[PDB]
Amino acid sequence: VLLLDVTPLSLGIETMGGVMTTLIAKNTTIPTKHSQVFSTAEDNQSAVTIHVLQGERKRAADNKSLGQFNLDGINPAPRGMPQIEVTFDIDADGILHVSAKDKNSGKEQKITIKASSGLNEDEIQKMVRDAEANAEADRKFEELVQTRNQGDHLLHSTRKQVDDKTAIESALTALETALKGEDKAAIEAKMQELAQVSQKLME
C-alpha cells in the first residue's frame, strides 16, 4: 500500500492544569481504539469533564476542540481513588466515539463526533509546524502544570494537617501566591519552605 487512512493529529483529553493528555497518537492508523484510566483532581470530586481535543501542542487551549461532556454521579472520594476509564474509538468511517466510565458507580457517558470535524489540511500543517516550533516552549508548560498540580494538592493536603501554624499558614499563602505564577522553581521553592515549618506536625 502506498496509501492509508490515519487520524491526522494527536487526539486526547484535557487534564488538570490544562494540559492535553493524549489517547491516540497522530498518524495512527484507523480504525484505532484506545483506552486510558483517569482519576479525580480534587478530593470528594463528584463529577468530571471530558473534553476531546485535536492537535499536538501541550496546552489544551491550543488544541482543537471536538466536543465535551460530563460524567456525573461519582462517589465523593479522595483524589486519585476513582477509576475513570476513558476510551477513544475511531471506526472505519473516521467516526470518533469517546466514552468515560466510573468503575464504581458504573455511571457512563459517551460522545459521538463527526468525521468532518477537527483540523483541515492548512490547519494541520500549522498545528505541527507550530508544535515543534514551540517544542522547548511546551515542555515548559509541562513541568509547570506538573508542579502547580503538585503544590495544589499540598496547599490542599497540608491545610488539614494543622505556632508553627501561624507559620504554616504563611507558607500556604506563599505557595498559593506562587502557584499562580509561571515560575516553577519558585512555586517549588515555596513548597520547599512549607516542607520545613510543617515538620513539627509530623514530629
Binding site: 483529553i13 484535557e14 487534564t15 488538570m16 493528555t21 486510558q36 484510566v37 483517569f38 482519576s39 479525580t40 483532581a41 480534587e42 470530586q45 463528584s46 463529577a47 468530571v48 469533564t49 471530558i50 460530563n70 483524589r79 486519585g80 475513570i84 498540580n149
Partner: peptide
C-alpha cells in the same frame, strides 16, 4: 502513570 481531570464548570 495516571492523570487527573477537573470538575465541570
Amino acid at each position: 502513570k495516571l492523570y487527573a481531570l477537573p470538575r465541570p464548570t
